[PDB]
Amino acid sequence: QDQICIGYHANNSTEQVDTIMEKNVTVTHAQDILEKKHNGKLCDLDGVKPLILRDCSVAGWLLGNPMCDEFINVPEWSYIVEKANPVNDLCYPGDFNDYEELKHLLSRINHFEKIQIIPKSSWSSHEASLGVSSACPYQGKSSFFRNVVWLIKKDSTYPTIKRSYNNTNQEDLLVLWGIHHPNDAAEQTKLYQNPTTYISVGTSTLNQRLVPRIATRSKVKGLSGRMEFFWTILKPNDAINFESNGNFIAPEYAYKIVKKGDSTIMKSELEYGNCNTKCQTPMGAINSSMPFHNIHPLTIGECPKYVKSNRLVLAIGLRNSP
Amino acid sequence: QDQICIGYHANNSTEQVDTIMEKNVTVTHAQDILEKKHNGKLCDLDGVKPLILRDCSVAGWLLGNPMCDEFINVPEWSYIVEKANPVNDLCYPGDFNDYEELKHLLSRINHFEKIQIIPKSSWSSHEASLGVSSACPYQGKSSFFRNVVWLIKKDSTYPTIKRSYNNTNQEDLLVLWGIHHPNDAAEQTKLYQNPTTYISVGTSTLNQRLVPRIATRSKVKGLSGRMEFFWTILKPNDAINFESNGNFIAPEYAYKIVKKGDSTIMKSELEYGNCNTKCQTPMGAINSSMPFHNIHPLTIGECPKYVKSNRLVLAIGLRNSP
Amino acid sequence: QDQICIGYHANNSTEQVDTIMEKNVTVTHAQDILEKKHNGKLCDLDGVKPLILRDCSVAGWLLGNPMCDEFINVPEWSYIVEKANPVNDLCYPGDFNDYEELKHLLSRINHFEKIQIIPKSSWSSHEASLGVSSACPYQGKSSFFRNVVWLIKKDSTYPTIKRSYNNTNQEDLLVLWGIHHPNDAAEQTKLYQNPTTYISVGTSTLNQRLVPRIATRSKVKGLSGRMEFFWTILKPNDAINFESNGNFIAPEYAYKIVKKGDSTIMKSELEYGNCNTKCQTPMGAINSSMPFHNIHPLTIGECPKYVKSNRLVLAIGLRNSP
Amino acid sequence: GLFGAIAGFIEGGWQGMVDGWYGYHHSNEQGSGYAADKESTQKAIDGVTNKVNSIIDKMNTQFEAVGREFNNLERRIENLNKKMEDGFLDVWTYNAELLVLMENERTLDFHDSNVKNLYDKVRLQLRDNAKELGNGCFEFYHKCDNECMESVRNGTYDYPQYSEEARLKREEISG
Amino acid sequence: GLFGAIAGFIEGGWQGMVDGWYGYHHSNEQGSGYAADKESTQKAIDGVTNKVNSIIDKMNTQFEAVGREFNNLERRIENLNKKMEDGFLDVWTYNAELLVLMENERTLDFHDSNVKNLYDKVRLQLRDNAKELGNGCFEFYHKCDNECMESVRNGTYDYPQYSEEARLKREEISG
Amino acid sequence: GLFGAIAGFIEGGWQGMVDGWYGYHHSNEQGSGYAADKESTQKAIDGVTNKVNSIIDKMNTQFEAVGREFNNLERRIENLNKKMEDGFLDVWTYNAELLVLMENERTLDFHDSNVKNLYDKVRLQLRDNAKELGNGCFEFYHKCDNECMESVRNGTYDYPQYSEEARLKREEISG
Ligand SMILES: *[C@@H]1O[C@H](CO)[C@@H](O[C@@H]2O[C@H](CO)[C@@H](O)[C@H](O)[C@H]2NC(C)=O)[C@H](O)[C@H]1NC(C)=O
Ligand SMILES: *[C@@H]1O[C@H](CO)[C@@H](O[C@@H]2O[C@H](CO)[C@@H](O)[C@H](O)[C@H]2NC(C)=O)[C@H](O)[C@H]1NC(C)=O
Ligand SMILES: *[C@@H]1O[C@H](CO)[C@@H](O[C@@H]2O[C@H](CO)[C@@H](O)[C@H](O)[C@H]2NC(C)=O)[C@H](O)[C@H]1NC(C)=O
Ligand SMILES: *[C@@H]1O[C@H](CO)[C@@H](O)[C@H](O)[C@H]1NC(C)=O
Ligand SMILES: *[C@@H]1O[C@H](CO)[C@@H](O)[C@H](O)[C@H]1NC(C)=O
Ligand SMILES: *[C@@H]1O[C@H](CO)[C@@H](O)[C@H](O)[C@H]1NC(C)=O
Questions:
Q1: CA E14, E18, E19, E20 torsion: positive or negative?
Q2: Which of C28, D113, D150, E29 is most open to solvent, judged by the fewest CB atoms within 10 Å of its CB?
Q3: Interface membership of F104 toward E (CB under 8 Å)
Q4: Chains near D (3 or more Cβ pairs under 8 Å)
């Protein structure tokens, strides 16, 4: 007797799917929507290399920390990678004013160029090579931050300094300088003859007056003194005016800056792996069409939505009771 | 032969709808859920007019910047509209302390009333009309902020000023004052005989002592000096005590303030257009029943949820298979 | 003739449920997904009692505000409960520096132990018992904050104070101290002979110099003077160095601190109610299986999601129109 | 559809029917014509309208004001706010799109079910008194005047009243 | 409903049936009575219970502490937190409400479908050995004692056992 | 299932059918074999693929950078950022999980409906030319060679070509 029957596909597949009303429903074909894989590499972000400071902090790199690698011109970056605890930060101990906002500003830069702004050879009535410490060694020799100059009295005097720089460049330029807070009046007198001292810094926007703070402090890297750093963005064709009586850590080098966008500072122990992505993670980059992932929350770029799950499996086939 | 047939509606409608499993499905009737239309005009928020400062910043308006238009009494507003870059801000260059928190405080005000607090004629041993600058021109004539007074030495003296105001009003009142920072000791002496100078301001809450900051600065509107402004909220039955030796920009007018709610500062180039809404946008107001919109993210009022799409079309009719 | 019919359950239920297309659908059985019940009491959080300050603020409690209840050692807490406006804050009027960050830091503590660091009996050339006021009465007698000492000149001199404490403990320790801002030069002279005065405080991290601020202020609790308080976390094996000329409110007691997690400060009028939960609310605790609740937004612990509704009822039975 | 009705065995909607969404067409000795089933149509409209209104009204809307109030030394907080706004936009956009797709689909399938269920109700009314043509149309094994069909729309078809006649015509054509 | 069963061709629930969710009512010579179908009822209960449990358990809940820690010179940040909390409340409220509505509808349709599938199961079991009345009831063309209906509920109805007698009554009714 | 087909009256899938998702099996005198219904399979595949692609593509993804930039005297703001991140994670996790569950159920029910509709199309095609076995198998009242089955899958089964032989075999079977 002749027959026709209507039926559906089956296979030996073992993929399981969950349902609002059922769990572990074995099925013909399934597709995971959740991304779990990364490349283990730090990569370019949209074809733009990140700035990787290996054992240096942003501060140690901006200032010329001798223990930080020699300065290499990276004219452009998309994000910054620091390690959890860079060993090389401030060789001479102290502080950096509005440091976090500066790091955020530098997180993504379209053009960056170190530029000599006030030559060390132009300080004529002050000693510019005695401002040196064993805590900041350069080549066996005791030294100091390299883009910045620690001025010490000459002969037995410290003439009042008046110096100004006009930004004749076509870009904003980041200017950095500092104060020395010594441990006692005798160190004051010894380094800069004048006992009561100031540093005034002026711009079309800035109106600052810093006074050293003598205080007995615990030793850090063997030092009880402190270096406190400050910065501004000198607009093109504006000028910056420094005046000081002592305790002045003057600029020598500064930075041309062009900023078009923002990112952040990524903490990772990984390193560059000649690579490009649209999504970078401290554990590695992601090539992602999937709408969700579970790698790591601290991401940068057009990444899928971070989620706490091990599986988002979509049924595409049909019920398969083998 | 007799017949009964079951069938469904169709028409010539071209309205399309998308479906989880199908796209561009022509349909009988549909309804868009997404609001895309605005009125292009700045409107009242729940029938309360906004404060629209045309070419003035909040700073220029609070202090009496002459080039801000003459002060018009708006006793109440729901939100404030500034332009992207107001030309009339601080006529004399300088700064406004805690400016953003003040603007936020003023964003929505239930009652606002200017009040003479210290008459200009009550300064008997100081010059109260020589305090005038070309950076603050009124009508070709050099002038100054009108709600605040730039005090100048008389003959060759600046006696210590001791002044207090007791808030005998029934409302909190916003009080404003300032410091002058000159460029050198000679300008100091020229304006206020006394070389070492202070301004102390006291309240049940406030304990401030300001000292001018001499620094060589670049010219802004031809001036190297700077004006720095400060404020408080004087509680009813509290008093405010000023003592000054020089560089004091004294209050004359202050403001009765009652605050019951908050909004923000909207940036828009538009103008008032006699209108009322529950949702305002820098591009125009929204008459909103829809749960979603795509106009602009920076909204104020009971607005629909901002979404990035061009249409959210709901099927209501049925398939229209031709 | 014999018959078989297929049918479904019905009952006396009045339970209604809503649907995308229908409202008020009477049903056989339903289950609300929304939690609405609390126990009206303050409870332990994962078996850890909160710190409940009755009428004292955190500031009044840390310092020894005499009018705050006697200090009892609670070595551990999960969160802090204050009242909306604790009556006992700063007995002597003034301010607490970075107070909110300190409260946030203390919100959840794994170990806390008050410890004497600088004995009152060690002040020999300074008066350590004259620093007393009627606004801070202890036992009928005029007094002051109890963990901190208001030092006054002895005979007619105030020798410079140089003091250091080394954290020989194994834990971080919270150190508190203050400045007195007087009302006139004559009070300065009367309390501390020296007219121009400072307090310098140093640590491996801290480098501070405080200068008292004379300003004429309105009376608060009969006083026009002000007390300004400061704090740090002294790391183990670091030392803290004080130098002062006058106006110094020295530490006597400080606190051993161990922090393993964070919570917040809850504002509530309730009192302890011998209890344990995973979700605390100012209105009472929640024993919660439900995924949503509508009690109160200001919660602490693993709580369901706060939602604005009175009813989230899931149909489980079937249509029951009797 | 999911219920095989609308673009399955009934292949096409009726341009001619204007009164409603689902209904009937008769052809008898008095002539032919369309007529809409008011009851089911009204239930369908009420359901769909209830749906749109529930997608709209369930939205909770409070007052919020936004909002660019941080200065250029508060850009980290600016970034925190940007992550918040953008996060919410992403959430709302995704959820709105998928809600629309899903409920549109369900609406169409709802129509399917309505048409199909109407067909089944008629089918159950006549049983062996007519033949299924497959069209979603029924070929009468007897003569059905206007009262007969109007009564079918009433749901009052009296099956035994025509039982014998239908039977006779039926066994006559069967061979 | 979507499957025409529950308030469609079977119009009304059984107060009399208490044992379960879906089942049978028989009327024979030995008397009448209700009896619930254990299988379909347990399947439905497990399904709905699983649905509720999935709405509940899929929720991720971490520890949070909130939270009014900013002073009156930090009101912009306070407002950022307010926009955040309010945003999340709006999200959760909307999604919760609509989730409940959608899954309610689907649940009712699920009951509908279960009933319909049961009816169809009996239907396919008997075939032409009984007439469909429209009630959701089957009228036997033969004698079905207690054990016979027992067999119908068991799904063990032996059709050829009754086929010939049933055929006789069926065609006897034919004219 | 919801449509009683896939784990209902058809009890088992076909390992033998690989060409597609739904189809036909014949055993006639020329032998036996499987053959897939191309069209319905294409509709189902295109539909499900459309669903996955809509779940994926409807996602809006902008650039964001995160992000731990606050110091230890900015821990209140830090906590605000944590409440934000944790809130968004909770929202996305809940919504993703439930989306997956809901759409999976609908997918299976969709297959169910497709099989059922296929069965119905064939059923209406052969009418009284065959017996319904209940398995989803039809037993022919006539001789249906390979071109004939070809016509069934084509949907061009010529019913009047065989109606008479079928009536004859049927009444031959009738008693
Ligand atoms: C920085 O130097 C430049 C070049 O000398 C100055 O630019 C000119 O300044 C004069 C007045 O000093 C103006 O009259 C011109 O209009 C300026 N020309 C350009 C190209 O800008 C600039 O003024 C200096 N900046 C400062 C603060 O003195
Ligand atoms: C401002 O003036 C008011 C009113 O004269 C003062 O308030 C009075 O204070 C005294 C005690 O100091 C009370 O006995 C009176 O009852 C208060 N008056 C009122 C309105 O109740 C207030 O002291 C002055 N403000 C300051 C601090 O100088
Ligand atoms: C605080 O006191 C401790 C205890 O003496 C100091 O720590 C020791 O310093 C000596 C040298 O003076 C070393 O020999 C020991 O190894 C140190 N012990 C430890 C455990 O560190 C510590 O230097 C003092 N802190 C400060 C900042 O003065
Ligand atoms: C579902 O399947 C997984 C393995 O695929 C298993 O771990 C889990 O226990 C199963 N759940 C149940 C309750 O069957
Ligand atoms: C949807 O409709 C537009 C016409 O308005 C058409 O251009 C587009 O390709 C359609 N999408 C598809 C491919 O279905
Ligand atoms: C639904 O029922 C509630 C009471 O449970 C009633 O208040 C409300 O008006 C009803 N809604 C409608 C549309 O009848």
A1: positive
A2: E29
A3: no
A4: A, B, C, E, F
DSSP state of A173: E
* Residue having the nearest C-alpha atom to atom 2 of ligand 4: A24
Burial of E125 (0-12, 13-18, 19+ CB in 10 A): buried
Residue in the structure block whose two tokens are 């959608």: E102
Q: Is some CB atom of chain D closer than 8 A to the CB atom of C305?
A: no
Question: What is the third-level CATH fold of E1-175?
Answer: Hemagglutinin Ectodomain; Chain B (3.90.20)
Residues of F in contact with E91 (CB under 8 A): 91
Q: Is B24 in the pocket of ligand 5 (CB under 6 A)?
A: yes
A264 secondary structure, DSSP code: -
Burial class for F53, CB neighbours closer than 10 Å (0-12, 13-18, 19+): exposed
- What CA–CA distance (Å, rounded) separates B226 from A203? 11
Closest C-alpha to ligand 1, atom 20: A237
The residue whose C-alpha atom lies closest to atom 10 belonging to ligand 6 is C24
* Distance of CA C99 from the midpoint of ligand 2 (Å): 30
Which of D13, D29, D67 is facing B10, going by the closest CB pair?
D13
| C203 vs A: CB within 8 A | yes
Tokens 């015509």 locate to D169
Contact F51 B308 (CB under 8 A): no
* Interface E-F: count of C-beta contacts within 8 A: 58
Three-state SS annotation for chain F: CCCCHHHHHCCCCECCCCCCCEEEEEEECCEEEEEECHHHHHHHHHHHHHHHHHHHHCCCCCCEECCCCCCCCCHHHHHHHHHHHHHHHHHHHHHHHHHHHHHHHHHHHHHHHHHHHHHHHHHHHHHHHEEECCCCEEEECCCCCHHHHHHHHHCCCCHHHHHHHHHHHHHHHCC
How many Å lie between the alpha carbon of A200 and the closest alpha carbon of chain E?
29
- Residues A62 and A242: their CA atoms lie apart, in Å, by 20
What's the gap in Å between the CA of F117 and the closest CA on chain D? 6
**Pick among F50, F107, F111 to test the B interface (most B CBs inside 10 A):** F50
What resolution in Å is listed for this PDB structure? 2.5
Domain regions of chain C by residue span: 1-48+271-322, 49-270
DSSP string, D73-139: T-HHHHHHHHHHHHHHHHHHHHHHHHHHHHHHHHHHHHHHHHHHHHHHHHHHHHGGGEEE-SSSEEE
- How near does any CA of chain F get to the CA of E62, in Å? 8
C-alpha C296 chain-centroid distance: 20
Architecture of the domain spanning A1-48+271-322: Ribbon (2.10)
Nearest CA to ligand 5 atom 5: B24
Domain B49-270 fold: Hemagglutinin (Ha1 Chain); Chain: A; domain 1 (3.90.209)
Domain ranges of chain F: 1-175
The one-letter code for the residue type at C311 is R
- This entry's atomic model was obtained through X-ray
* CA dist., res. A186 & res. A195, Å (int): 9
Q: Which residues contact A214 (CB under 8 A, 6 or more apart)?
A: A181, A182, A183, A184, A185, A188, C200
- How many beta-carbon pairs under 8 angstroms link B with C? 39
